Amino acid sequence: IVEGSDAEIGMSPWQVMLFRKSPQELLCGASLISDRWVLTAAHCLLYPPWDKNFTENDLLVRIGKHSRTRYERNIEKISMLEKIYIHPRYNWRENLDRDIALMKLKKPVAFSDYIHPVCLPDRETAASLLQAGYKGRVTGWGNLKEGQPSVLQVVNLPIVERPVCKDSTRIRITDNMFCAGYKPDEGKRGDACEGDSGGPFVMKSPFNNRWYQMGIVSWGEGCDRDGKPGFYTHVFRLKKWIQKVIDQ
Amino acid sequence: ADCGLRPLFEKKSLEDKTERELLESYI
Ligand SMILES: *[C@@H]1O[C@H](CO)[C@@H](O)[C@H](O)[C@H]1NC(C)=O
Structure with missing residues (x-):
């Protein structure tokens, strides 16, 4: 920003951070829409011109964060992904039409004062x-x-x-x-x-x-x-x- | 049922520092 x-x-409290596992790096923002679904942009996961094509096991999310660096004990939550869904008509070569993807969490996240859809x-x-x-x-x-x-x-x-x-x-x-x-x-x-x-x-x-x-x-x-x-x-x-x- | 109502704001009858800017824009 x-x-x-x-x-x-x-x-x-619906803000989600998408990370690459290895090497660990912040990739993209995302949003919490239920206890096990996260919405993001397709180009965050799939972009062939930059050799980007992540699977579930390449990624993790962190939820409930305020500080970029600080670990927020008993507040922030980490989740693995069960499955990724990219819109089948996502147009990565021309105009990024239908730039949308869904990610299902491996386990539901607990809602809190800091985590809410x-x-x-x-x-x-x-x-x-x-x-x-x-x-x-x-x-x-x-x-x-x-x-x-x-x-x-x-x-x-x-x-x-x-x-x-x-x-x-x-x-x-x-x-x-x-x-x-x-x-x-x-x-x-x-x-x-x-x-x-x-x-x-x-x-x-x-x-x-x-x-x-x-x-x-x-x-x-x-x-x-x-x-x-x-x-x-x-x-x-x-x-x-x-x-x-x-x-x- | 509960979506989009923040525990530390709407649920507590508290407003954040810039949400006025959003609501005033809706002409
Ligand atoms: C992404 O990788 C998978 C194999 O892991 C492959 O099936 C798929 O075609 C790739 N998507 C591309 C290149 O758009």
Whole structure:
């Protein structure tokens, strides 16, 4: 996260860190959607141009963390993966359309003050909240500058109008993505970075006070987008795939 | 039943430092 601020303790209890086992390295953010399911970006697990093709046994997750370095005794939890599911129509060569993956934990994680699932969006939430100008929130331990944070970082970012999204890049965008970020004009320039990829873009419903995961942080390299908005996988549009994987 | 309600915030009737920014944006 660039130009964010320190998260408060328990502010993002669905935040998950994805690690490579050996050599040990932070790969991507992710999110807790139940006691044994984690949502992330497909490109976090499968990206052939960089010889990336992780299996379940290559990876681990850490849940309930606040500090990047410090071990948080009796608070943070580690889990192995039973199975990885990548969207069968994930397009890694062109535009990263359907950049979404699910990971099933080997054992269910115990919920706590620091570990709690985020809601999947329903139709009403998707229809009313996913509008240009409306702000969502990204959290992560990704890079800090165009270097690394001590505690979880948070930034709030406005959804960008679709024609602006299309004009911000040369690759063919689809309806399965949306873009968020501040205008190249004055104001702020908070953003998600590499490392924050795979993590949740969340919005709070004023109707019922709940947090909904509307997006998944898609591709990023460093903290430089050349002033362009970042892209997010549209979770609601891919909700039936998620349900098919989790149920039956 | 319980998703998206944080134990240390919504469940305690406490608000985080920047959630106002999100809710005020919803025009
Ligand atoms: C990933 O590796 C498995 C074998 O471990 C293979 O079946 C699959 O084709 C690979 N995926 C690629 C290259 O996209």
